[PDB]
Design a protein around this ligand. Structure first.
Ligand SMILES: Cc1cc2nc3c(=O)[nH]c(=O)nc-3n(C[C@H](O)[C@H](O)[C@H](O)COP(=O)(O)O)c2cc1C
Ligand SMILES: Cc1cc2nc3c(=O)[nH]c(=O)nc-3n(C[C@H](O)[C@H](O)[C@H](O)COP(=O)(O)O)c2cc1C
Lengths: 173, 172
């Protein structure tokens, strides 16, 4: 019932975040926005960008979503430049009161919380309802050799989606 | 005292460019003007490190004695254009470098979220982000004459003056 969109915030074609975003796509029947495809240009605020097929598709896909998972790697203690660039095309027109769940992909140690805070702050900036439950996945959460999440990491991801579904239900109610 | 200023707005007609070009001219700073769109989207691939503009970005920031980061506040964060540019950089160019933050906002309480994002990312590349920071709102610009107001020029000088003191301290 919930029309879920997942944004892959990593621009790296061979990166870890893409494993997570494609897991959500396949396992939860989510529409992926895969920033590793580089079909969205740098935002420059010019009118012609609003006519580009991929800018219109980004805006339409996020507006129509019942809920969004924003995934990002932590790059230098923030979300990716790629993800922020995509969000610069969007606004409260597509996000107002939309349930949003955040998942960051980190390099281990204490990485990921700075990206999650950046994402929560920007999320509130477009007036999304960023849910309480959030998640950081470290490299041990990934089997890169088989392009998958570990069983434990699939369960942690499901926990975010389950809460996001409860927030979707409340927004419908 | 080799100063670099990054214009974080990608908008050719934007306000932040007035501030960044003010600093370039008044304080003899080298500008990195992201409205030129000569830097592509970061993708981590090896070939990007051979691009002239990526090499220029890295060399310009590495050799700077001090850096002003300017950004507009876009959705309560620094611009995607500025964050994209920083994703090319690292502690290799920033470690212990004095860095001053100036955000350009739309009025009201805008600009602090951008400053916070820039300070957190700046520490993440191990810069010494100085205490003094600034937000300029639309009234700080005379856009018709492509200039800052005299009051705004004094505020910008205050940031530069503190950055020069931190530069001198780092010369230890
Ligand atoms: C430009 C860049 C900066 C990074 N900075 C951080 C960091 O601040 N915190 C962190 O936990 N990992 C950092 N990493 C490592 C990522 O967490 C790691 O690459 C992870 O797999 C997610 O990125 P990916 O989806 O592109 O693979 C950084 C990696 C890159 C490419
Ligand atoms: C995509 C976008 C989002 C913006 N979000 C914010 C915001 O969160 N806070 C704010 O103070 N102003 C916001 N503004 C207004 C900017 O502060 C204003 O455009 C200002 O002139 C700086 O941007 P510029 O240098 O591109 O002109 C936003 C503008 C754009 C284009």
């Amino acid at each position: 019932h919930m029309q879920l969109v997942v944004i892959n915030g990593s621009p790296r074609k061979s990166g870890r975040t893409r494993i997570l975003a494609t897991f959500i796509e396949k396992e939860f029947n989510a529409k992926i926005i895969d920033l590793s495809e580089e079909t969205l240009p740098l935002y420059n605020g010019e009118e012609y960008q609003g006519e580009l097929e991929h800018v219109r598709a980004l805006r339409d896909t996020v507006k129509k979503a019942d809920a969004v998972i924003l995934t990002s790697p932590e790059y230098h203690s923030g979300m990716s430049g790629a993800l922020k660039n995509a969000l610069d095309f969007l606004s409260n027109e597509q996000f107002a009161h939309k349930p949003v769940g955040l998942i960051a992909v980190a390099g281990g140690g204490k990485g990921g919380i700075n990206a999650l805070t950046n994402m929560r702050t920007v999320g509130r900036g477009v007036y999304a309802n960023v849910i309480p439950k959030q998640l950081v996945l470290d490299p041990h959460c990934f089997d890169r050799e088989n392009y998958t999440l570990t069983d434990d990491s699939k369960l942690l991801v499901k926990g975010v989606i389950d809460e996001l579904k409860l927030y979707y239900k409340m927004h419908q109610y």
